[PDB]
Amino acid sequence: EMEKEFEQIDKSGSWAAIYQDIRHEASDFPCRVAKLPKNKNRNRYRDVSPFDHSRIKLHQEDNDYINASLIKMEEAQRSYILTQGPLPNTCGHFWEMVWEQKSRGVVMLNRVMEKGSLKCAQYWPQKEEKEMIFEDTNLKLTLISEDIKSYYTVRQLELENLTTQETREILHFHYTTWPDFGVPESAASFLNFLFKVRESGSLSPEHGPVVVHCSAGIGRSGTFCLADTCLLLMDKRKDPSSVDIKKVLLEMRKFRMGLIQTADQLRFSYLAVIEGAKFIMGDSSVQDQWKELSHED
């Protein structure tokens, strides 16, 4: 059981070994398409590639490659698309993926600039009056509104398929204070953010899979997805004891490599699931407490 295991690991100071045990057991599958020379400029990082078997294919006859993975969680009945922060040449591909996969939400866990370097392209419009047109994929993207809180921002976007003139509302959930290779400032603020994504409908089965991304789409993105799936499994059984976080993480790593990039992100995922468990087990009041402790304004 996870809280007992948690302490045990803390008392023995063996998070580094626990986490490397996961690295050692993690699945290895080919990433042949990702490594084709014609795709070198579609990958942000050399060592982070989607497996062929789970990669998202773009619906274009030209080149269907995007660095993005479908993480399909069978028992939990939730899917996520994890992808890298779009590149200046893949912003069109990114929104084509959102359209074709029928996603409702995009979860962004990074800032455009971190540690003095550019982690992600400016792939959405920052001003209502300056909409973006992606000419390669024939899509139009308009900022409709923005709700800025102290550590995250929610944007309503309108995505238009210029070829058919259909339009969809996309919700952009932007966590702005989660450090590159780091952990959130508290269990509360992370959980407050995840539940605001949940409350929006964008994780719902009537929509396509939520699109989750950081710079590489494995570390912060993996933490977010792992905590959500753990909480959902606990919910379906009302049985915190039945949820094995390491096994859940190993199952996710069948669909994309490298999920959870540090031992402290693993430890933080335990923290988030344990705390989140209070809400799942019937204490509705904790949600409000997280909101207060998060200091969102």
UniProtKB/Swiss-Prot annotation:
Residues modified to S-nitrosocysteine: 214
Keyword Cell inner membrane: no
Family per record: Belongs to the protein-tyrosine phosphatase family. Non-receptor class 1 subfamily.
Top-rank taxon: Eukaryota
Shown part of the complete sequence: 2 to 298 of 435
Residues recorded with modification Phosphotyrosine: 19, 65
Gene, per the UniProt record: PTPN1
Subcellular location, record wording: Endoplasmic reticulum membrane
A GO MF label: non-membrane spanning protein tyrosine phosphatase activity
Lineage: Eukaryota, Metazoa, Chordata, Craniata, Vertebrata
Organism annotation: Homo sapiens (Human)
Residues recorded with modification Cysteine sulfenic acid (-SOH): 214
Subunit structure comment from the entry: Interacts with EPHA3 (phosphorylated); dephosphorylates EPHA3 and may regulate its trafficking and function. Interacts with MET. Interacts with NCK1.
Principal localisation: endoplasmic reticulum
Membrane topology category: Peripheral membrane protein
Keyword RNA-binding among UniProt keywords: no
EC numbers for this chain: 3.1.3.48
Record's protein name: Tyrosine-protein phosphatase non-receptor type 1
Cross-link N,N-(cysteine-1,S-diyl)serine (Cys-Ser): residue positions: 214-215
Outcome recorded upon mutating residue 180 to A: Substrate-trapping mutant
Post-translational modification: Oxidized on Cys-214; the Cys-SOH formed in response to redox signaling reacts with the alpha-amido of the following residue to form a sulfenamide cross-link, triggering a conformational change that inhibits substrate binding and activity. The active site can be restored by reduction. Ser-49 is the major site of phosphorylation as compared to Ser-241 and Ser-242. Activated by phosphorylation at Ser-49.
GO cellular component, one term: endoplasmic reticulum
Catalytic activity as recorded in UniProt: O-phospho-L-tyrosyl-[protein] + H2O = L-tyrosyl-[protein] + phosphate
Binding-site residues, substrate: 180, 214-220, 261
